[PDB]
Each structure stands twice: as C-alpha cells, then as structure tokens.
Amino acid sequence: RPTFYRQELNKTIWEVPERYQNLSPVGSGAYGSVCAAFDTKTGHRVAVKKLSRPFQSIIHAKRTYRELRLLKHMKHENVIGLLDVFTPARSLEEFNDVYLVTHLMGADLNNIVKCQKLTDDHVQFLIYQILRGLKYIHSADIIHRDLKPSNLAVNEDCELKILDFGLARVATRWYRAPEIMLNWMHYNQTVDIWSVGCIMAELLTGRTLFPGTDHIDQLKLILRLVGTPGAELLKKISSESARNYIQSLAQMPKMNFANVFIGANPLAVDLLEKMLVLDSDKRITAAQALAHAYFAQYHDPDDEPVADPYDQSFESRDLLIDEWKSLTYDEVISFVPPPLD
Numbered sequence: 001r002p003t004f005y006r007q008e009l010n011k012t013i014w015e016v017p018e019r020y021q022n023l024s025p026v027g028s029g030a031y032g033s034v035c036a037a038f039d040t041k042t043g044h045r046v047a048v049k050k051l052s053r054p055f056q057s058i059i060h061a062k063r064t065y066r067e068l069r070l071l072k073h074m075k076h077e078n079v080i081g082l083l084d085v086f087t088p089a090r091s092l093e094e095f096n097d098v099y100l101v102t103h104l105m106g107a108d109l110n111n112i113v114k115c116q117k118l119t120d121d122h123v124q125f126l127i128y129q130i131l132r133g134l135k136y137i138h139s140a141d142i143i144h145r146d147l148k149p150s151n152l153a154v155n156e157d158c159e160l161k162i163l164d165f166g167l168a169r170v171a172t173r174w175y176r177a178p179e180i181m182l183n184w185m186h187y188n189q190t191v192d193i194w195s196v197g198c199i200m201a202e203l204l205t206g207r208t209l210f211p212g213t214d215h216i217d218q219l220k221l222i223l224r225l226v227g228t229p230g231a232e233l234l235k236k237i238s239s240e241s242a243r244n245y246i247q248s249l250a251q252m253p254k255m256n257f258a259n260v261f262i263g264a265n266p267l268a269v270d271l272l273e274k275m276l277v278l279d280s281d282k283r284i285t286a287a288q289a290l291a292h293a294y295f296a297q298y299h300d301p302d303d304e305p306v307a308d309p310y311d312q313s314f315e316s317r318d319l320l321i322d323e324w325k326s327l328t329y330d331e332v333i334s335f336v337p338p339p340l341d
C-alpha cells in the first residue's frame, strides 16, 4: 500500500498517493471535482477526479459503480481512460472515497469555439475523432445520450477525448436529439449522431445551431431547419399532445442546408444533412460517417477499432447501498493499470 498524504483544496480534503504531486484544481462537476497533478512515476501531468459523496444514497452508489465499471472498460484513444484507481481506505468497512486518474487535457470544446474561427481542416480532425470514439462506444452497446461541448476534452495538439461527464466549473438541450426531448424512451444509438451534428454546425459557423430557450422552443427551432416531419414520422408519435403541438405549428418547409451553411465545405454540408435527420432510423451511423468523403485525409478503416462487449446487466438491478459499495470496492481492488509506454 502506497503512502498517502492529506491536503485541502477548495473546502475539499484530498488524500492521494505520494506519486501524485502538485495538486492543482482544474474545475468541478456535480458528481466530482478534478485536479491537475504531476505523476512522478511517468514524468507526465495527469488529472485526478475525486468523486463527490460517492456512497451517499442508492443513486450515488450505483452511479459510482457505473462510472468505475465503464471507465475500466474504455480502452480507446478518443475515449477517456483510466490510468489509476485508488482509495485511502484500507478495508471495505473504511471505504468511502474514490479517486480516478486519467490523462490531462487542455480544455473542453466550448472553451475553443469561444475563440471561434475554426479552420475547415480543424473541423475534419475534431469531428473525425469524435465519430471514431463514438464508433468504439457504440460497438459496446453504450449510448452516451449527453454529448455536448463540455464533454469533449482537447489538447493544444488538437487531440480529443470523449468524457462521460464534463466540467461545469452551454445548455444540454441545445444538442439533444428530438426524440429524447419528446421522451420516446426507446432511443437509438444515433441520438449521439444528432448531437455530433449539432456540434459540427457550431464549429463551422461559430453559433449554436438550435439555441432553444426551453424544450418546446427547442423543437420549433429544429423544425424550422429540418422541416415539419412527414406523415411516415407522425404515425409513430403516440403522444396526442406532442403530436398536437408539432402539427399545430404552421408548416415549415425544409431549409436548403447549402444556404444555412453557405461558405462551408460542401462535403461538410453533405455530412450535416446526413446527421441532422429527424428520423433516427435514417441518421448516418458513426461507422458510416467515418467513411464519408469529408474525412478522406484521416479515414483509416484498419485503425478504427471496436470494443469488447460491455456487460450492462447491473443497470436493472435494485440493490442496497452496501452492495453497490462492496461491488465498487471489488472493482477498485481488481483494477490493473495499463502499462507505461
């Protein structure tokens, strides 16, 4: 067992192994707080996330378990991965703190579009990396469901990694697929493609595509561009109210994407039209998108790997906080780090 040391950072008390020095706060989310640290064993800076109140309720416990099991499975350059997992606890009784260690990125994508003026080559590389990691995640039968700029970390090298939760230290609805905002509850993997399409449009133009003020304003904005849904889509909406509002709006023709995104790479416009499709059955998948001519300079089919199947069966079980905690402890003690290069 390594030597731990205790220091306080932003009303928060941190107990981390000796090998991580110079703890420096980066930001905070709702489920944890992130610090920068120097890894003496590798000579590289890293990010340490202390989970906030990990076992304070049934929801928190399952969430803690969920993040550990998921991040332990993700082994892909464009998806955040685990370099280390530790807890000062010496036993399961004495277990109540969880720390996760990953690579250290430079910022999130909304801290970059805030500068704006992103070149077209920059959009090809950034979106290609998202899709490439999206393909890996989707091959594991995982849906992100919350893709947004704050969940995309980037380096000054322009390398990108999909986070599970970003820093709140950019409304989520602006990037939500319309079916989620309708509460379909049977979401397709392509709900993430819609979000990617919303993010791409923002990178190319410098403005939020659908800056809706609420969930109802959000759908009116989506309809103004993609157009009122056809009869084939309407018959699939069971909600009379939802169907009533959609049809109640004065019909709006689909806008010419070429004009809305005039000045953009015509190959990018073509991709946006394939992602921003109302029917989720007709949206281009992540794997299909990587083969679009827009990513010709980066597409390498022998270097776009898939993931081993992920067991998500625990998601349905209703367990006690103590059982969620012991399972989390089991995952902590069993973690095997990836080998240093």
Ligand SMILES: COc1ccccc1Nc1cc2cnn(-c3cc(C(=O)NC4COC4)sc3C)c2cc1F
Pocket (backbone or CB within 6 Å): 026, 034, 036, 047, 048, 049, 071, 080, 100, 101, 102, 103, 104, 105, 106, 107, 108, 152, 153, 154, 163, 164, 165, 166, 167
């Ligand atoms: C270990 O944390 C986590 C562990 C597991 C899952 C999620 C997380 N979360 C999480 C992970 C990273 C990894 N890099 N960044 C980061 C650093 C930024 C920054 O300002 N760096 C300075 C420039 O040199 C210091 S911006 C930004 C998005 C992160 C933010 C996170 F919320």
Ligand SMILES: CCCCCCCCO[C@@H]1O[C@H](CO)[C@@H](O)[C@H](O)[C@H]1O
Pocket (backbone or CB within 6 Å): 070, 074, 079, 080, 137, 142, 143, 144, 145, 146, 162, 163, 164, 165
């Ligand atoms: C690295 C891959 C991240 C997987 C996405 C999990 C993190 C964001 O997704 C989480 O769980 C659900 C996922 O369907 C979302 O609906 C929730 O909003 C969020 O808490």
Ligand SMILES: CCCCCCCCO[C@@H]1O[C@H](CO)[C@@H](O)[C@H](O)[C@H]1O
Pocket (backbone or CB within 6 Å): 178, 179, 180, 182, 184, 185, 186, 187, 188, 219, 222, 223, 229, 233, 236, 246, 278, 279, 280, 281
């Ligand atoms: C106000 C804009 C109307 C939104 C129409 C959303 C159509 C989404 O598409 C639908 O996704 C469903 C799952 O979510 C699938 O079950 C359907 O097969 C698919 O057509």
